Amino acid sequence: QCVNLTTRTQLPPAYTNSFTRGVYYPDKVFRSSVLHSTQDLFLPFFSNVTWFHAIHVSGTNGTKRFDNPVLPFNDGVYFASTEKSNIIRGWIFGTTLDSKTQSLLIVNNATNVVIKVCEFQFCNDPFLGVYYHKNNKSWMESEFRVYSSANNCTFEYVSQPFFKNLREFVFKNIDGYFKIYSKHTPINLVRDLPQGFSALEPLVDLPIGINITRFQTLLALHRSYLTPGDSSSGWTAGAAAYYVGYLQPRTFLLKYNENGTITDAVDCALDPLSETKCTLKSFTVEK
Amino acid sequence: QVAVLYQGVNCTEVPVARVYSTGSNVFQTRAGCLIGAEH
């Protein structure tokens, strides 16, 4: 069942950039040593990406909250997470996120990741309770507090039971098909996603074929809801976080290496120099 | 750094025409409107 959250407080949302971040292979083909121009929904270069701290910390003393508001889903969402303790555990997608219409549930658990398509009855604050230090010994005990009732489980997929890290995710809902692109990368001392270049490969195509307009996030309740403990209930005082981006129709010029891996690309509609590069079909322009 | 040139247009409609970002050295020539270069 679902339990309430006690301390809420507030903190103004922060911003950061996503310079050359969030590029995925458009089609499933092989190229080599050839730059090619495509046209698909991408994250624009140098974009204002919203920032949420997994623990909405009012003070490092122990005053905490969860920063999990419902957010729009407009022609795609760029999702990534840097963390050190697997706080993020899944997401819910839909339009009203109620039992009236079908919704998609995809949640990672301490045993296995679960994918369901049912008419769940979502509460205001769905979460995953964690009892890492709640019991006498130090061991991982989870808790399921996402929804109340589930109906019409049209689709079901489950997995077998089983130093900050970035985990980029790209979601796209077209032609009744849901697309997931991911990538793993080790990292360190990065309050915000660092700069560089990486390619997101497809993970699974999946034929839900329903209407998604809004979405939210599933977090790990490291504390309890009645009385967690001494203080500092959240881990590392909100160091765990995630960011949200919005893809827009653009036109890109991907460059493939000899091994067929995408190495660099430009945004044709950012600055006149890039427009020239796209027109001349090259990465270098003479006087 | 690059400079853009619009062909044969008065430097009055160029704002409402990569943002122009207001008037910053909008030097006008017979060829057209020249942006981003000093005379």
Partner: nanobody
Framework: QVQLQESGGGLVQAGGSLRLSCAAS????????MEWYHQAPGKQRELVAT???????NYSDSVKGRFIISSDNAKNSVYLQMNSLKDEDTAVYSC????????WGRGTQVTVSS
């Protein structure tokens, strides 16, 4: 609209505290470079502090230890706090930005009383 406006100038005695604040309408983040220029009367313009997009920060030799340049990502602007003011710090300060074409601002004439 002035794409980059500067504020904070005025008169002040030596050794005081001051915070130059110039704000730009455009995102301070895709601009890729913030810098501050002040020119002494009878002297050429000189650079004060530069902050690139990545986050690297540099200060002039007569700037280290006292002047720190910062930029809060809540209201798009760049901040520059002055302290331990000395009389040759009196100049006309201007903050410079360059996304793909030079931009400039006006005002902020600081005077150090000694």
């Amino acid at each position: 609209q002035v794409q980059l406006q500067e504020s904070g100038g005025g008169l002040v005695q030596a050794g005081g505290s001051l915070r130059l604040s110039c704000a730009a309408s455009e995102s301070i983040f895709r601009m890729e470079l913030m810098e501050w220029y002040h020119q002494a009367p009878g002297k050429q313009r000189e650079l004060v502090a530069t902050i690139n997009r990545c986050g690297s920060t540099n200060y002039s030799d007569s700037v280290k230890g006292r002047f720190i340049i910062s930029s809060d990502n809540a209201k798009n602007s760049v901040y520059l706090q002055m302290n331990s003011l000395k009389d040759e710090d009196t100049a006309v300060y201007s903050c410079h930005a360059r996304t793909w074409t030079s931009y400039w601002g006006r005002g902020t004439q600081v005077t150090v009383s000694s």
